[PDB]
């Protein structure tokens, strides 16, 4: 019920559309009034509970009430934009460290995620690349950080 919790759930809906860029930004500012482990625990805990609600056979999708894979990719997009956008120090290790302690989420779940339904191929190759991506940021601190440095490039233009 916590407003960043709602930004992030916002963020990471069961629409086809989004997150947009003010969606995002709107989960950033969460940040002054909460800790940024928090925020990433719960980005990760939306997308587990996403993967686990899902039917592992046609019999149980048969017997309870196929796009739970957007609000999976939606929340590695989350996961990224905060990587590359929170401030150095407290801030990032905070993110790295809520990912590490959780780590079979990418090297596992995500590594070997399979969307279930025509356009079931795309969908899962979209979400591991983006797994993957924020591997490598966490695997190549020096990456992240020039991947950082650069995001600042167009900063103060709005």
Known sequence: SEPYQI???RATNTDAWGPTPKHLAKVLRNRYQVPLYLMTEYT????VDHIATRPKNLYEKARKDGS????VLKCLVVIEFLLLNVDTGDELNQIRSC???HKHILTREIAQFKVKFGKMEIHERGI???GELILQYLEDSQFLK????????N???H
């Open 7 to 9: 930004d992030i759930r």
């Open 44 to 47: 990760l805990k939306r997308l």
């Open 68 to 71: 739970e894979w957007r609000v």
């Open 99 to 101: 990912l590490l302690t």
């Open 128 to 130: 591991r690349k983006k």
């Open 146 to 153: 020039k991947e950082r440095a650069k995001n600042k490039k």
């Open 155 to 157: 900063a103060l233009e």
